[PDB]
From a paper:
Human serine racemase (hSR) catalyses racemisation of L-serine to D-serine, the latter of which is a co-agonist of the NMDA subtype of glutamate receptors that are important in synaptic plasticity, learning and memory. The first mammalian structures of SR, published in 201031, revealed a dimeric structure with each subunit consisting of a small domain (residues 78–153) and a large domain (residues 4–67 and 156–316). The roles of Ser 84 and Lys 56 as the Si and Re-face acid/bases in the catalytic cycle of hSR are generally accepted.
However, the structure with 1-x0495 bound remains in the ‘open’ conformation, with a cleft between the small and large domain that is accessible to substrate, whereas the structure with malonate and ATP is in the ‘closed’ conformation with Ser 84 in proximity to the malonate. Before the small domain can move to enclose the substrate (or malonate), Tyr 121 needs to be expelled from the core of the small domain so that it can adopt the ‘closed’ catalytic hSR conformation.
Numbering used by the authors:
A (entry chain AAA): 4 to 325
B (entry chain CCC): 3 to 319
The structure:
């Protein structure tokens, strides 16, 4: 019915489990007191590469074919220069194949250097999408690689869904999962998984109000991407949902909660100070959601809530003051 | 053997406190394993209630010690500390439904006073001298039918800290060594008593700043050699010297002491933030720095499974 099935999520977890961490679920008395709820924190900030994106990236590397005539990818290519690019480079290294990141000339110098230091090759493009696409397609074809989209690629979505297999196993009495949403690869993967296994468990999305396409899409009942590039401290959720994740989100996600920039900042600081976990602000989005006024509308029966702390890739010097 | 505590006291403390403290997780790190050549296990006391292990000793003391009064239960706690110790004692007081008073010089800055009140301590003012601090604390303790609790030499505190090792031995059955930051040595002594009672083949190693190397010097000389003057170190939590109660335990039951430079502490603390995403305070970086140090590299390869106590996460941000 959708672009992935629960079977694909299980194939993904078989494919990746030898190379990822079964990350712990931690608790906090303090956050329990603040929210009214029994919270559980799925600690993907401790995952290999610093975020959950290694799940989808490694599944893609281990499951996708470059061509009808070649079963083994000979390179990986992406336009992601964030957590996805980092994860994809790690996955490529594991599999002994080169990684190429397509990067606009306008990218910051510090980022160009970091990409290279981590062991990816940079291929430069113009800031234009026309050039970006020309360059990446060319790289993919010439290197016999796989292009791996950060959120719309079925193998990626399936890999991210493995988070939910772990959460359900780790928290048998869980009532809901709260998931930050950008392109919706993680949300969609989780939603497929939870609804296949235990549909009584709620799946809630958490999104910046400054980048509220998932909320607006669910509201309108059709895919409504951000018209303009969003401004938000939650740098990891600036992507809009897309054609492959939207149908899953429309049908299988129970509710969306939007949170202000101040709410994201305060929740992130709370996690830092009271939980001693170095989450990136993007991973504070789910925490802000459960703390938010609108979350009070969630039935009191929904008691045990697992929040995905999706990443810990923060630059400390910059995060001294926002 | 005989010391100010035995393992029996640690077992008592465990029963006294377990219902109110977190059994903190033990986490691992591939990169730190790769840097050290060992199998490392991180006992996450930074996730303990109040942000450090000190709630263990503090709660044990509040539930053990008696005031100089008719009634057996303390009616308040009184402290000089606005740090990990005082914050622990304050939380213990809240659990027991009694006020926590902190004696503060009248001249203290407004920001410090606000910080103190935030965690729920009640300020009583004194004059800015050691004489006035002592005398005000004595008065308040007596008038409120309260107790005071030494941060590292109090037997009830030493016994409480030992509970760290009780958990570690359960969580890491094949552990070969514990690495423990040492200041006053309440934590080191409690842990040493516990380990040597339960599984004496397991090594107990201390870690301290080379800028505050009284433990190392004391073990070398075979006698208590306190820091001659208050040390300067980023590891704010281990500025105290070992004392008369913890020294004999450390002398007899601690296998070795590793010293680490300020740069090593800072770098280890950064490595843990960046690579482990754990907001340890620099004092908790001391034990990590120890296991990364050149001296530790030479430790027998048989000592493979090493548990480092990440003692606290109370850092100013
Ligand atoms: C990518 C990412 C997300 C969102 O994932 P999508 O599949 O794009 O919705 C959330 N948090 C972090 C840290 C991420 O890196
Ligand atoms: C108090 C403290 C120590 C040292 O404990 P002692 O019993 O004084 O040796 C170490 N780390 C932290 C975080 C502390 O608060
Ligand atoms: C902030 C920064 O430098 N991000 C780059 C992340 C990245 C992307 C692709 C490959 C490798 C890395 C480190
Ligand atoms: Ca969005
Ligand atoms: Ca010392
Ligand atoms: Na192809
Ligand atoms: Na599973
Ligand atoms: Na239920
Ligand atoms: Na589709
Ligand atoms: Na003080
Ligand atoms: Na005693």
């Amino acid at each position: 019915q959708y672009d992935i099935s629960f079977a694909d999520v299980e194939k993904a977890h078989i494919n990746i489990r030898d190379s990822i961490h079964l990350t712990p679920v931690l608790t906090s008395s303090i956050l329990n007191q603040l929210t009214g709820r029994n919270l559980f924190f799925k600690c993907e900030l401790f995952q290999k590469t610093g975020s959950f994106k290694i799940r989808g990236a490694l599944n893609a590397v281990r499951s996708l074919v470059p061509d009808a005539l070649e079963r083994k990818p000979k390179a990986v290519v992406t336009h992601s220069s964030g957590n996805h690019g980092q994860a994809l480079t790690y996955a490529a290294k594991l599999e002994g194949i080169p990684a190429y990141i397509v990067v606009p000339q306008t990218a910051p110098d510090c980022k160009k250097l970091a990409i290279q230091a981590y062991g990816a090759s940079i291929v430069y493009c113009e800031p234009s999408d026309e050039s970006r696409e020309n360059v990446a397609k060319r790289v993919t074809e010439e290197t016999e690689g796989i292009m791996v989209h950060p959120n719309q690629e079925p193998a990626v979505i399936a890999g991210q869904g493995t988070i939910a297999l772990e959460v359900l196993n780790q928290v048998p009495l869980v009532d809901a999962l709260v998931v930050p949403v950008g392109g919706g690869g993680m949300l969609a993967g989780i939603a497929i998984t939870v609804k296949a296994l235990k549909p009584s468990v709620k799946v809630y999305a958490a999104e910046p109000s400054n980048a509220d396409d998932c909320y607006q899409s669910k509201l309108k009942g059709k895919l409504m991407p951000n018209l303009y590039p969003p401004e938000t401290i939650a740098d990891g959720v600036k992507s809009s949902i897309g054609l492959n994740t939207w149908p899953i989100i429309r049908d299988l996600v129970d509710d969306i909660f939007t949170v202000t920039e101040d709410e994201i900042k305060c929740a992130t600081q709370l996690v830092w100070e009271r939980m001693k976990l170095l989450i990136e602000p993007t991973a504070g989005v789910g925490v802000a959601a459960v703390l938010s006024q609108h979350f009070q509308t969630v039935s009191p029966e929904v008691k045990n809530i697992c929040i995905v702390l999706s990443g810990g890739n923060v630059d400390l010097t910059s995060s001294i003051t926002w």
